Point group: C3
Chain length 117, copies 3
């Protein structure tokens, strides 16, 4: 059993609901960073606070959740269901392998470093 | 696949040139974060906005681009050519495996999640 | 052999002592970011500046160091020794594979891109 990092870039105003939904499902641990970004070119022009970010990078938030591999699909599904709005700019999710996890306080590793105690 | 995350740490004043050159080559999707860092020991001491940084962490920008593996060399070439100044502190690039990519709005995955409209 | 990213999330007040202990041991290259986070549910409720945090995320610092795989254990040891306090919230470390490293100034790839010249 391996571990994975789910790295989701989502709208800043979706952070609270996504983190509630993840938490309600038992995926509590997460790290969040303020970022700016753009997605693919073309199609409907992205709007943020009232029509149009044609050239500049748009505020987003990055959520990183390290989970057991078997939980990745669950986590992605919860993020997409709760983050989406139907407009361009809703977000993108990347899954990255994590070879080791260590809890700083105790030097526990692996599965136990991810478990409620 | 496969997909890769190109994570480049560059000078803050090189964001605009690098973003434009990447865009002009088709690499539009990107996530940008403000960071501070140090590189290897040695090199002329870095100044930044008038202040010398003999020991302290220096402002940088992190750019993250998830791309098809076959595009990584092109992305690297573009970043190096446009980010460089010839002085120590120009940056460093890390290539990290990505096992899955999902577009939030549509649940599209893989190559389709990187494709332009 | 291979290269790894050590991604450590620690308390903001521990940045100074942890970075100095790393650089004293030769692990000078690092990228630092401001983040917020939470760990696992249960047990003692995390406190920060005089209040409990449960729904709300707590300020942390992320330190990213790309090192040789054979340096990871020592890096993790230094971080844990210096970052720990024994209270909930001390931190978590993730080890992520890095397939390629490139120095922007020179285009050097691999082992040399982590070394003083
Ligand atoms: N290939 C990528 N690499 C890195 N970050 C990306 C990439 N694609 C998107 N992002 C990040 O995700 C954010 C949201 O992207 P966005 O929702 O516009 O994706 P999209 O692929 O254009 O899909 P949509 O058509 O739904 O907009 C961007 O602002 C950026 O921060
Ligand atoms: N091994 C590393 N791990 C994490 N981040 C690093 C590492 N090396 C460099 N960085 C980041 O890249 C930034 C730029 O590094 P820098 O350009 O000084 O690299 P260098 O290896 O010292 O090459 P140069 O000789 O051109 O200075 C740093 O300030 C830091 O943010
Ligand atoms: N599974 C995870 N995924 C992503 N980030 C995490 C995860 N768990 C913890 N973090 C990050 O590490 C920080 C510190 O977590 P914390 O020290 O509370 O871990 P813990 O597992 O609850 O251990 P402790 O019992 O020692 O508190 C969090 O605020 C968050 O930034
Ligand atoms: Cl000291
Ligand atoms: Cl290890
Ligand atoms: Cl990563
Ligand atoms: Cl280095
Ligand atoms: Mg888009
Ligand atoms: Mg340097
Ligand atoms: Mg905790």
């Amino acid at each position: 059993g391996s571990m994975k990092k789910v790295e989701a870039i989502i709208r800043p105003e979706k952070l609270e609901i996504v983190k509630k939904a993840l938490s309600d499902a038992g995926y509590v641990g997460m790290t969040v960073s303020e970022v700016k970004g753009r997605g693919v070119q073309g199609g409907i022009v992205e709007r943020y606070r009232g029509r149009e970010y044609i050239v500049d990078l748009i505020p987003k938030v990055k959520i990183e959740l390290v989970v057991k591999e078997e939980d990745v699909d669950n986590v992605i599904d919860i993020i997409c269901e709760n983050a989406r709005t139907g407009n361009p700019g809703d977000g993108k999710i990347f899954v990255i392998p994590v070879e080791r996890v260590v809890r700083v306080r105790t030097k526990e590793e692996g599965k136990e470093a991810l478990l409620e105690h």
